[PDB]
Structures are given as C-alpha cells and as structure tokens.
Symmetry: C3
Subunit: 450 residues, 3 copies
C-alpha cells in the first residue's frame, strides 16, 4: 500500500531559550527532526511533508532529504490547522501517517505495527496508558471500540480519569483525511483546530479506529526543553550501547560511551570508558580503544591499539598500528601497517609508512614518509611559508635525529640519516648524513644570574 | 522579624578516617559547613554562631564569614549542652534557628517555610516521615498537635513505630530558648542533654509547636562518612545540572558534568561530557566546550570553541577564539579576538593578539604577542634565567619559524620574519628576517651503528 | 574439614561472538574464571579441578594457579556428565564444592556459610528466590525439607510456579558424590546428565539437603553475553568503590572510578572523576589524583599531586612530587622528593632528582638527573642511535636551556649551565657553560612569499 508521511514541526519551542529552531537541536549528533524524517523514509514514505512556521532558512540549511515537501503554517492554529495546510498534497489513494518533529525516538517497528492495524477506510491510532495522563488527549471507547479523543482542557473530571492517552501519531487514507479535515471547527476550550476531532468524525461515518501501543514510553516522548532532550539522548545512547554489547562489542562501561553516527566493526573490539564515536567509523577485528578517545569519520584496521586520550578525525590506520596516548590525528592522516605514533604527536595530510615511528613531541603535516623510518622526538615538518603549503618527502629506512626541522619542499633519500638538531632546507641524498651543527664549546666557571 | 542562626558542628567525625575535621570536607568544591553558613546568611541571619569542639585552628583557616561567632563546646554532652554554650549570645528579641554543620543540602526555601510556620511564642519544627525511622527522634502528637520528641534509645517499641521523625532543625525565640535550656537534665538513656526536650517543655507552658516538612529527603541528610558525602555530591551535581539544562545550557550528559563554583552563561552554550567547571566562570553566547575540559576562574567570550581535553585556569578569551585539543592555559593567559591555540601548547602570563596562532608544541610564558602573528610549531619563549623572569615582545604581522627559541628579554618588530630553528637573543628590526643557521651539509655513504 | 573445588567451564559461549573462550573474558582486568579460582583458593580449596571442553591452549596460557587440575570434558553431555569427568580425582574424605566458571561474583563469605550448613553425610545447596524463575531448576520440598530439583524443561506448569531456584552451587562429601554420580541417567527432557539429580538421590538414601541463600543476586549471576558481563563489571566497580569510600578514600564520583587490580592507600587520598587504577598501586597519605588519570603498577608517595589527564605505568614517585597535567610516565620513571613534571612531558627509564623540574614539552629517556636541576622546555635526551640505547647523566644544580638536545652517552657535570638551543655531544665540565650557537644576524626588508 502506498504511504506518505506528514511531520508537524511548526509549534514554538519557547522553553529551549535558543536562537536555533527547537527541532534542529541534536540528539546523538543528528537534528531531532532528522531522526523523524529518517524513520519516515525507513518506513517506506513516498513523500515527507514538513510543516513549519519559522526558522525556515535554518531548517532548509539543515535538511536536504530529496523527498521533502515544505509546507508552511504561518499561524499556529492547532494540529488540525497544520494538517489542513498539508492536506492538498495528500494523494487520494495513499495512506497518510502523521508524526511530530519533536518526538525523535519513534521506532519504525512500532510505526509498521500501526500501519498493519489500520483498517480499510479507517484509522490506525497510537495510544499509550500513563499513570498520570494529565495534559494529554483522552481516548474514549464504546463497547471496547475507540470512538474519539477528548483534549485535557475540554475533558470533565471524570473523563480525566481515563489513563489511555493519545500519543498524537495516527494513520489514515488521504482522501478520507481530506474529507474529515474540511469539517474541523474551533469551538472548543482552546479555540484551535484539533486534528484529534477526526477520530470522532470517522466513527460517526461508521469507520473503524483501532489502537496500538508503543513498545517503550521513550518512543513517544516529546521534547520542549533541554532537560527532556538530555534524557532522550541517554535513552538513545543506552539502547545503542546495549545493541553493540549484544553484537559482540565490549564496552567497559556502556553508560560512558557515546555513538553519534555509524559504527562498523569486526569481532572482539574492546572500547574503554568515555570514548566518543562520531560520523562514520569502521573498526577492524580486535581493535582496542583506551579511555577518553574521540574517533570521527575514520577507518581503523585489525589489531590496532588506540591508547588513552587520543583524538582522531578523517584518518586511515592499516592493521597493527599503535597510536597515543595523547596523539592527535587530523584529516588526511594515514598510517600503514604496524606504524606507530606516540605521545604529543600531531599528523595532518601526512602518511607514515610500514613499521615507521613518530614517538614524541612531533608535528607531521603535508608529508609522505616511507617504511621503516624513525622520526626522532621533536621533529617538525615546516609546511607553511605564510601563504602556501609545501610537501615533505622522506624515503624508506631514514633515521631522523631529534629536534630536526624539515623546511618543505624537500626530499630525504632512502637510507639517509639526519643529525639531531638539524635544519633541513635542501634535498638529502640516499644513504647520506645531513647535518647543520655548531661544534659544542665551553666556557669555564660560568655563574648564572643572581 | 530579626533572626540569628546557630550551627552545631562539635560532634566527632570518626568514620571519616581523616586528619581534617569532618565539616571541612568539601562538597562541590566547598566545605560542608560553608554550605550551611551560606544558607544561614542567604536566609537573612544577623549572626551565625558556630559551635565547635576541636580542629579550631583548621576551621578558622577555612571559614572567614564576618558575622561568625565562634562558640566552644569542649565536651560533647549532647545537642542540648551545645546549644547552652551558645545561648548566652542569643538576643531576647530575635528568632534562633538551629542547623547542623554536617547537613549541607538544607534549602533556604524550606528554612523560610519553617520560619513562617513558627507561631508567636512557639516553635517551628522540621520533621520528616521515613519508611524506616530507626535511630531518629520520634515526634509525639496529642490531637494532631506536636507535644514532644522521644529519642530512639529512650523510646519504647510502640513509640518506635512512629514514622515521623525529627530532622533536628528548629526555630524559636531567643528568650524562650534560654528559658527552656536552663531546665535541661541528663536523666535519659544516653546520659546527655537533649535539645529535643525543649519541645515538651514548651508544650507544657502552653506554647504551640508546628511542624513543616522538607521538599526533599536529601535536604536533611547528615554526613558521617565519605560514602554518604559522595551521594550528596551527586544529588547536588544532578540538581545543578538540571537547573542549567532548564535555563538553556546544553549538557550532553548531565550525569557527567561537575560545577564547583559559579557559572555565568549566555544562550546556546553546549557542554560535552566530563567537563568540570571550577571557581567563577563566565561563558558568552554559543560557547562550545568539548569533552573532558576543565575550566577554572576564567572568562570565555561569544562563539569560542574549546576542543577536547583542554585545561584552563584564570584565563581570558575574547570572542571567536579556538583552543585545543590538549591545550593548557595557566594564569594570565589572554587571547584576543579570533586567536587560536592548538595541541600541546601552553600559555602563562602571555597575551596572544587578534587572529594570532600558536598551533602546536609550544610554550609561551611572559609574553606579549601582537595581531595576525603566526607562531610556528615548537617555538619556546625562554623567560627564566634561573632566578628572574623576563618578557618577550612580538609585534604585529610577525611570522615565527618552527622551533625558534626567543631568549627574553627581547622584542621582535612588527612585520618581521624569524627563520625556522632560530635562537633569538637580540631585538629583531621591523620587516627584517632574523636567522642563526648553519648551512646544511652532507656526508656520503653514512652507515648507522650496528 | 578438607575441601576441594570443581569449576565447570566446558559449556560453549556462543552469544559472545568471540575467538576468545568465554570464561577468559575479563571483569575488572581479570578473567572471569580467575575470579572463581581466586574465590576457591580464598575459601581454602586444597585442589581446584577445572573442567573444560575447548580453548585449552588459551586457557592454559591465562591460568597458572599451581593447584589447578585440568579435567577434560570433550562432549558437553550435561553438568552431571562434566562432574563425572572430574569425580575420579575427588578424595573420599574431603568435601567437594561445585562452582561455575562464568559466575564471577560469588563471595567467599556466602561459600563459607554454605560450607557450614552442609550436614554430615548430606548436601549444602545454594538457592535463591526469584520473581520470575523461568529457565532455572526448581527446588522441591517435603515438610520444609529439600527433596530434589526439577529442571525447567522437565517441570510441569504447577512446579514452574515454585520461585525458589537452584543457583547451581552445592557442596557434598567426595565419596558420596561419586556414589550418586555413577547412578545418573539421561532420561529427561534434554537427554543430558543432570548434576541436579543427586539431590533426590541423596534424599532417597536418607541424607539431608540444607539450603542457604546468597547475600546478593549479583553473586550468582552467570554471564553468556557481553551485556551481562558489563552489568557485573558495574556491580563489581560499585562495590569496590563503596568499600574504598568507607575505608576513607574520597572518590569525587564513585560511578566514575575503575579499579582493575589492587589499591593500597594512606589517609585523606582524593581521587577525582574518571580515574582508572590498574595492576598494583600504592598511594601514600594525602595523594590527590585529578580527573581522567590512569595509574598502573606504580608507587606514589605522601602528598603527591597528580594533575589531570596524566598516564602513569611502573613509575615510582617520592613524597611531594607534582606531575601533569598531560604528563606521561612510562616504565622506569622515577621522581625523587619534591620533583616536578609539567605538561607534554614524557619519562622512560629516567630518574629526576629532588626538587628537580621538567616543566614542558620534553622527553627524558635512559637518564639520571640530579637534584635541584632545571630542564628547560623542549629538551630532549637522544638515547637511541638506531640499534642501541645510551644513558644521559646530568649532575646536581644544572640548568638546561630550552630546546637542548643531549646526545647520549654524555655527562653534564654538577653546576653546569647549557645554553638554550644547544646540541650536546660531549661531556660538559662542572660549573661550565656549554653552547653551540650561531650568532643572530638579520636581513632588512624581508618580504614573505605571496
Ligand atoms: C650525527 C651523529 C649521528 C654522529 O654520532 P657519532 O658518529 O657517534 O659521532 P662522532 O663523534 O663520531 O661524529 C661523526 C662525524 O660527524 C662529524 N662532525 C661532527 N661535528 C660536525 C659538523 N658540525 N659538521 C660536519 N660534520 C661534523 C665528524 O667529523 C665525524 O666524521 P667522520 O666519521 O668521517 O670522522 C649524532 O651526533 C646524532 O646526531 N645522532 C642522532 C641521535 C638522535 O637524535 N636519535 C633519535 C633517538 S631519541
Ligand atoms: C629563512 C627562510 C624563510 C628562507 O626560505 P627561502 O627564501 O625560500 O630560502 P632561500 O634558499 O631563498 O634563502 C633565502 C636567503 O637566506 C639566506 N641564507 C641561507 N642560509 C643563511 C645563513 N646561514 N645565514 C644568513 N642568510 C642565510 C640566503 O643567502 C638568501 O638570501 P637572498 O634572498 O638575499 O639571496 C626559510 O628557510 C625558513 O626558515 N622558513 C620558515 C618555515 C617555518 O618554520 N614555517 C611555519 C609553518 S609549519
Ligand atoms: C647562554 C646564555 C645563558 C647567555 O645569556 P647572557 O649572559 O645574559 O648573554 P650575553 O649577551 O652576556 O652572552 C654571554 C656570553 O656568551 C658568549 N656568546 C654569545 N654567543 C656565543 C657563541 N656563539 N659561542 C660562544 N660564546 C657565545 C658571549 O661572548 C659572552 O661571553 P662573556 O660573558 O665572557 O663576555 C643565554 O643566551 C641562554 O641560552 N639562556 C638560557 C635561557 C633558557 O632557555 N631558560 C629556561 C627557562 S624558559
Ligand atoms: C489537539 C491535539 O492535537 N492534541 C494532541 C497534542 O496535544 P497538543 O496539541 O497540546 O501538543 P503540542 O502543542 O505540543 O503540539 C503537537 C505537535 O504539533 C505541532 N504543532 C501544534 C500546533 C500547531 O499549530 N502546529 C504544529 O505544528 C507541535 O510543534 C508539536 O510537534 O499532542 C498530545 C501528545 O503530545 C496529544 O495527547 C493530544 O491529544
Ligand atoms: C537529642 C537530639 O538532638 N537528638 C536528635 C539528633 O540525634 P543525635 O543527637 O543522635 O545526632 P548526632 O549525634 O549526629 O548530632 C547532631 C548534630 O549535633 C552535633 N553535636 C551533637 C552532640 C554534641 O554534643 N555536640 C554537637 O555539636 C553533631 O556534630 C551533629 O552535627 O539528630 C537526629 C537527626 O540527625 C534527630 O532525629 C534526633 O532527635
Ligand atoms: C541440570 C543442571 O545443572 N541444571 C542447572 C543449570 O542449568 P543449565 O544446565 O541450563 O546451565 P548451563 O547450560 O548454563 O550450564 C551451567 C554451567 O555448567 C557448565 N557446563 C554445562 C553443561 C556441560 O556439559 N558442561 C559444562 O561445563 C557451563 O559452562 C556453565 O558454567 O544451572 C542453572 C543455574 O544457572 C540451575 O538453575 C539449573 O538447575
Ligand atoms: N627514542 C627512540 C626509543 O623510544 P623509547 O626509548 O622512548 O622507547 O626507541 C624507539 C624504538 O624502540 C624509537 O622509535 C624512538 O625514536
Ligand atoms: N603549520 C601552519 C599550518 O597548520 P596546519 O598545516 O597544521 O593546518 O597552517 C596554519 C594556518 O592555516 C598556521 O598557523 C600553522 O603555523
Ligand atoms: N620556564 C621556567 C618557569 O616556568 P613557568 O614560567 O612556566 O612558571 O619557572 C619554573 C620555576 O619557577 C622553571 O622550572 C621553568 O623552566
Ligand atoms: Co631546536
Ligand atoms: Mg624543539
């Protein structure tokens, strides 16, 4: 059956105290409304209608899904009114599923169950039972059948005793939807147009409304302030962490792990406390990640060991590499098999070859370093002249003495040796020793200042 | 109505296993007793009487509140006895509020409610209902009115069934207080002087005792050991975190955030996991703080981005600065607008000008660096000669080559360039190139040691 | 009474998705089965029989306890069958206690209570009452006495109502054990040999079976997947943290503390958030450890302060040392009294003397540095020539200027001074100034590249 989704996101997020529209606030590194859009497409949505009232410029900048139909609702006259703005775009022969832009954890599995419960010519309604139903629409039933929804403000004390409430999510045929929407009136407690009135309108026509319930309450929780957002962030992180544990990834403390993107992994991966994974990350077999690491958009091969407090972004590590602790890999950093980066070392657009080592206090930027190379502590590639960037090339089997500065562009031939403290401004020949040293001298009986 | 506060803090903290008096142990970076003193002053206390038995030297070193009246209780003969030591200092026409020095979370709002419930000539009592009231004073009532308190040890099995217990906090007129205290006797189960006996003494006189309850149990929890302290630390951090979230500050994980002082902030501030804020910190609008940062007594302007694992103390950052990851700012560090500090960079009593950059492996101490300056990786200001410290001055538009040592005192004129690997011992002229380099030479067929 | 322990660990750990046998997966830095072995020896076990089915090579590599008797069970025909494989090794006059290799938190205190409850000629059984007993053996009783165990699969709906279940742990005389085991048959729902059938076999003989219960459920929880493992890891860390707090160690956040080995400590030690302790660590009095530190197999003297994000392994710090933040001490690092290591400093097989300082951007490897020495920022000991390592010796009262490279082997005499930017290749005399500097020159009107 064909189906499109409508996302109401035109309400004002006042308790957020933000200059950024509420639905753009992120959860696990992704806009709340993007989570909803993803669920809609993942369910099979042909078109996704997004109803907004303001922040349109920022929304269009953040959202780029091709099948997004932007629907304006200049005045927020109620959920019913918002749906009327989008209704003209509904197809007469497709189901229309309504979702909220600020209820990010809704699962496709529950939406699928809701789709299957919807009867021909009727309506699928998602309801939930709460201990305290205060503030939400009450589900009314006659002989076990759903007959309508009464909003909290409009409900009597007795009706307020009803604990089964409307989550807001529902699905119904597009043509039927348009028929009911045209009949909405605003003669109620809030003087708004209630999308909820279509339930009674359908029942009166003899149509059937069936209700299904979410798997978890967190699935239909809405966000109006940052505290509520932080709680859903934890729920999301906890569920993702448990899935990873069940899939064979060892997290030393699942409450101290954050995944903000996608994680691909092999077997026996171990991840210590406080690690953060961002963007798309691929980990090979037996990768070990020490505490506090941050890994973003990077590829890590089999058997790599990432020591504590190492930050990595857009890097590629071959098998058996060891980096950190306190290493900092920036975009373009590449390590070939068995390479090693130690503490207080930074790499940017730089490749380190097989079995090569940069153990300490070093900066490698815009460089190509061969295999079996040893980079002494304190070595620095001077890749910038104040306007342009230049490349440093170091061949295989090179030994670079400590505190050497390589002024790019420059090439050091294979097998060369560079003396400690050297400033390299010209190419170094193969198997040669490069040096630029003042012989050590001494002054006797030197007395330091008082 | 005039009011003074008395804080009993003379009990022995044996289960703390410490050489530091129990009430001096900190919670959120502040002494437990200081939290109580703050609540007393915040309530409007004219005088704060502090009753202590030992550790007086350390207490006087830690506490400096001007309105503190030190009251000695050499022998701990009971709360009643402690109050008798302070009683002579009570004014006949003021209310006297009694608090414990080891119950740090008591809220001014609850104390205010207690003050308002206190009847003329009577007593305001703070009581709470517990599932297991074992160990605490039982509140006795006659026709709904409080008539006394019976200590656990003195109470019969039936009275021990009473679940409403004494939190210990109470308030009453000073003159009345002195009248009852003089009548205390130690003929009871513990052979001590019970401050709790004044409740029955007042009731017998025809005075009225009214009870009020705390908003939260944590508010009246006392600390006798480190475990109990750690629990109140979490409660405190959790409540502060939720307030910040409700005020518009985004905390990526409120359970992994610690504030130990005061935090001032603009809008849309984002704070990642494991950040610690100490002393007084001011954050502008849109400040983003990455994971694990520690910020103490510092000012951070609008739009700054503090990358992961950066430590800052007594620093001042103008708008749009970017620092870290792995940057270390010490007292006196100042960055002007748009300045940048990268990884493994340390600054102390050093100013970096507008749009200036110190991207890596650098130490800047006792320096003034102008605008649009580029500090190459590995640069070091040698500000110390073994006894004295000297200043390094670098004008605008200066380019400092990598691994340059600036031996202070020295001045580098505007527009100058310093060659990589230079040792700068003398002033450099404007628009000039400073250099101290040995030309690179080479020895063919060099064979490294076997 | 003499007693040996048998540990069943031959079951397949399928839901672990690992190439490492399930019982070898670690909890608090120690193999799950090692925790069980430790409990067995700690209880007084004369011999520990370990029944395994595969991964024998890896198991033998990990476990080395001298009193381990390896027992093979090639086919997993049931717990009864596994016990028959070990039974021949049981002594007729010793008690035999059965434990599971994947139930790591079993406490010696509970096992001791179980040993004391075991009646002469009978059986001690460890049982627990669960809300949902689904999946476990049901304890059957006649007039209050345990008469047998019925496995879930074999139990009727009514018997499945029984909530008291078998934890699996039991103890009985070796000779009796062998008598019952020989009678096991596999005519039951799973077609396996149930060790649980010995309960009914003993009762029929007129022997008495007494049941005792664990102190905590976590004590008898078994691990089949990583999620269950992570939960027991938290339970373990939480209990260890609370013990440390009760013993006088201040943990700023007990939920953000991990101990993976042994921690020895003095009084008033303070440990901030996210610290990880590994191997055997000894802390003196008043040691303060800042956030995120990792300390492994090291000794820390009285009054040391370890600043944030410092990593330490196999190091020895005397009293009053201060290191970090961002310091990295590797094996062999030694600091004498009052020594100081600052940020972005690394030490390996290097000793720093009393009151000596290495404040920044430095690497000290294979060195002996005297007292009252000052190591300038950027100093590096070049201890490696590509095949051999050499020692650097620096006497007392030496001042090493910034960015100095010491090419080992070399000795700097007491009282010497080394100029900033020096490359030291030869010994430096006492009280002498060593230097290898090119005088600073200048080129006027230098224009940087466009
Ligand atoms: C250059 C270096 C390799 C020489 O070590 P070495 O051979 O044991 O030292 P030597 O005293 O024998 O000097 C070797 C040569 O350098 C020459 N030399 C010394 N000072 C010189 C200078 N200023 N210019 C040119 N040559 C110089 C000598 O004349 C000699 O030549 P020769 O062998 O033909 O006779 C060494 O000083 C060095 O810089 N090592 C690197 C250490 C390092 O940083 N390692 C990384 C691990 S932390
Ligand atoms: C000094 C430096 C700027 C010169 O680069 P360059 O102009 O392209 O190099 P050149 O080969 O043309 O040498 C330039 C001048 O230096 C002079 N020179 C070379 N060695 C010299 C020495 N020991 N003493 C004095 N002058 C020297 C040349 O004679 C020449 O003079 P000229 O232009 O009047 O003919 C460059 O080597 C340098 O140190 N760059 C800094 C890189 C850096 O650390 N960047 C930070 C980003 S990571
Ligand atoms: C070497 C150093 C100590 C000299 O400082 P200074 O005495 O104030 O400087 P001066 O101008 O007086 O030079 C002192 C001597 O060095 C000599 N000198 C200068 N350049 C020289 C060279 N290339 N070779 C040999 N001697 C040289 C001078 O001739 C002079 O000798 P004299 O005193 O007999 O007349 C200083 O430049 C230095 O390197 N300080 C270390 C700073 C540091 O890194 N501190 C750590 C804290 S961050
Ligand atoms: C009349 C109606 O629908 N009532 C339901 C609505 O309450 P209620 O209408 O009170 O809910 P909200 O005001 O929070 O709005 C719901 C969603 O609709 C959006 N929105 C709202 C009004 C508008 O004019 N434009 C718009 O886009 C909001 O941005 C939000 O995403 O949701 C509750 C669950 O949360 C249900 O129990 C109520 O039965
Ligand atoms: C007789 C009395 O008061 N009983 C109350 C007291 O119990 P109790 O007297 O047992 O309480 P504690 O011994 O903990 O002492 C209470 C407070 O008084 C201080 N202190 C105590 C004795 C002394 O001689 N000097 C002194 O300064 C302690 O340091 C602590 O701050 O508090 C309980 C709540 O915690 C109440 O339910 C009890 O009804
Ligand atoms: C017949 C029997 O014993 N049933 C008990 C067993 O269930 P059950 O037999 O189902 O338990 P498991 O299959 O998990 O095995 C128990 C332990 O024995 C080991 N093992 C099992 C079979 C084998 O052939 N070899 C072997 O070494 C496993 O590795 C594990 O350490 O433990 C439950 C508690 O967890 C008890 O409530 C059940 O009454
Ligand atoms: N300084 C050298 C030393 O490191 P360290 O002595 O710190 O271990 O040996 C390493 C290989 O064993 C080399 O790559 C390093 O350049
Ligand atoms: N090394 C230079 C380079 O950094 P990097 O190449 O690491 O990005 O460019 C920066 C500005 O773009 C300069 O301030 C740095 O001195
Ligand atoms: N650079 C020096 C300075 O450090 P800093 O100025 O950063 O405090 O003084 C210290 C002692 O007071 C010395 O050990 C450092 O070598
Ligand atoms: Co140098
Ligand atoms: Mg250097």
């Amino acid at each position: 059956n064909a189906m499109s989704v409508v996302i109401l996101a035109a309400g004002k997020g006042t308790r957020m105290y933000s200059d950024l529209p509420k639905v753009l606030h992120t959860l696990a590194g992704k806009a709340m409304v993007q989570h909803v859009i993803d669920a809609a497409n993942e369910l099979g949505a042909a078109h996704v209608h997004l109803v907004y009232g303001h922040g349109g410029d920022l929304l269009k900048q953040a959202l780029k899904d091709d099948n997004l139909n932007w629907v304006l609702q200049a005045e927020q006259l109620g959920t019913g009114h918002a749906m009327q703005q989008a209704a003209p775009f509904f197809a007469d022969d497709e189901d229309i599923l309504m979702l909220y832009g600020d209820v990010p954890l809704i699962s496709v599995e529950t939406l699928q169950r809701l789709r299957d419960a919807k009867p021909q010519g009727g309506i699928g309604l998602l309801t939930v039972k709460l201990d305290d139903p205060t503030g939400y629409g009450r589900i009314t039933r006659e002989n076990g059948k759903v007959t309508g929804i009464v909003e909290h403000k409009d409900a009597t004390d007795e009706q307020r005793q009803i604990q089964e409430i409307n989550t807001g999510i529902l699905i119904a045929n597009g043509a039927d939807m348009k028929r009911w929407l045209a009949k909405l009136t605003n003669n109620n407690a809030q003087g708004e147009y209630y999308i909820t009135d279509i339930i009674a309108l359908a029942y009166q026509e003899g149509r059937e409304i069936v209700a299904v319930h979410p798997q978890r309450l967190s699935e239909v929780e809405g966000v109006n302030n940052r505290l509520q957002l932080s709680r859903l962030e934890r729920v999301y992180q906890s569920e993702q962490a448990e899935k990873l544990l069940l899939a064979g990834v060892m997290l030393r403390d699942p409450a101290r792990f954050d995944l903000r993107g996608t994680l691909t992994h092999g077997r026996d991966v171990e991840i210590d406390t406080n690690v953060i994974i961002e963007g798309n990350v691929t980990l090979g077999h037996r990768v070990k990640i020490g505490t506090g690491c941050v890994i973003k958009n990077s590829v890590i091969g089999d058997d790599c060991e990432i020591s504590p407090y190492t930050v990595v972004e857009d890097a590629n590590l071959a098998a058996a590499c060891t980096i950190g602790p306190f290493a900092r890999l920036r975009p373009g950093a590449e390590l070939l098999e068995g390479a090693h980066v130690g503490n207080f070392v930074e790499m940017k657009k730089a490749r380190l070859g097989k079995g090569s080592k940069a153990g300490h206090l070093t900066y490698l930027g815009d460089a190509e370093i061969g295999d079996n190379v040893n980079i002494g502590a304190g070595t620095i590639t001077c890749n910038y002249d104040g306007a342009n960037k230049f490349k440093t090339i170091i061949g295989d089997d090179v030994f670079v003495g400590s505190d050497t500065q390589l002024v790019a562009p420059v090439t050091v031939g294979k097998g060369a040796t560079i003396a400690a403290g050297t400033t390299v401004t010209r190419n170094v020949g193969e198997n040669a020793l490069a040096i630029s040293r003042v012989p050590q001298t001494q002054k006797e009986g030197w007395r330091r200042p008082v």
